[PDB]
């Protein structure tokens, strides 16, 4: 039973610092890659960030260069994303998930697999 | 009688610890987003170093 709990919602002002927490359960956490996906309200779904198995930041989106932070609490099986300098349109229905591909399975580190 | 030569024995070399591809990974992480893990139950060679 893989499970991901998302927190960090509510009414928040744009331009302010924000903390989002996703808790992972039902699967060994720190052997998989992991993804945050942006989803503007009233619009579609787009990739915003990710991080490797080794807790390595994949990078940041086009409009958010060098001002978000993605980190991984390996101790309590959790993941955090901090945002800064929000605007009205950086609002998104952010999603948390992992990667299907296992360590030492099928070169290079596999990081795709938008799965759960 | 005196002995001649020494013999040292041990079973086949078992599961090595996978140091290699931890350092041959696509990349390392940041300083605040730094990485740590713990290894046990495996043999470490140190010979490749």
From Swiss-Prot, chain B:
Residues 1-16 are annotated as: Disordered. Changing residue 49 to I: In strain: Omicron/XBB.1.5, Omicron/EG.5.1. Changing residue 27 to K: In strain: Mu/B.1.621. Glycans are attached at residues 4, 6, 12, 24. It comes from the Viruses. Disulfide bonds join 17-42. Binds to host ACE2. RBD also interacts with the N-linked glycan on 'Asn-90' of ACE2. Cleavage of S generates a polybasic C-terminal sequence on S1 that binds to host Neuropilin-1 (NRP1) and Neuropilin-2 (NRP2) receptors. Interacts with host integrin alpha-5/beta-1 (ITGA5:ITGB1) and with ACE2 in complex with integrin alpha-5/beta-1 (ITGA5:ITGB1). May interact via cytoplasmic c-terminus with M protein. May interact (via N-terminus) with host bilirubin and biliverdin, thereby preventing antibody binding to the SARS-CoV-2 spike NTD via an allosteric mechanism. Attaches the virion to the cell membrane by interacting with host receptor, initiating the infection. The major receptor is host ACE2. When S2/S2' has been cleaved, binding to the receptor triggers direct fusion at the cell membrane. When S2/S2' has not been cleaved, binding to the receptor results in internalization of the virus by endocytosis using host TFRC and GRM2 and leading to fusion of the virion membrane with the host endosomal membrane. Alternatively, may use NRP1/NRP2 and integrin as entry receptors. This is Spike protein S1. It comes from Severe acute respiratory syndrome coronavirus 2.
């Amino acid at each position: 039973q893989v499970q991901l709990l998302e927190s960090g919602g509510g009414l928040v002002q744009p331009g302010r610092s924000l903390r989002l927490s996703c808790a992972a359960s039902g699967f060994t956490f720190d052997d998989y890659a992991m993804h945050w996906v942006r989803q503007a309200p009233g619009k579609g779904l787009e990739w915003v960030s990710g991080v490797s198995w080794n807790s390595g930041t994949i990078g940041y989106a086009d409009s958010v260069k060098g001002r978000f932070t993605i980190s991984r609490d390996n101790a309590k099986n959790s993941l955090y994303l901090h945002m800064r300098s929000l605007r009205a349109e950086d609002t998104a229905l952010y999603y948390c998930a992992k990667a299907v591909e296992m360590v030492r399975g099928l070169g290079a580190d596999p990081e795709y697999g938008m799965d759960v | 009688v005196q002995p001649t030569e020494s013999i040292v024995r041990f079973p086949n070399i078992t599961n090595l610890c996978p140091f290699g591809e931890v350092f041959n990974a696509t990349r390392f992480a940041s300083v605040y987003a730094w990485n740590r893990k713990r290894i046990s139950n495996c043999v470490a060679d140190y010979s490749v170093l």
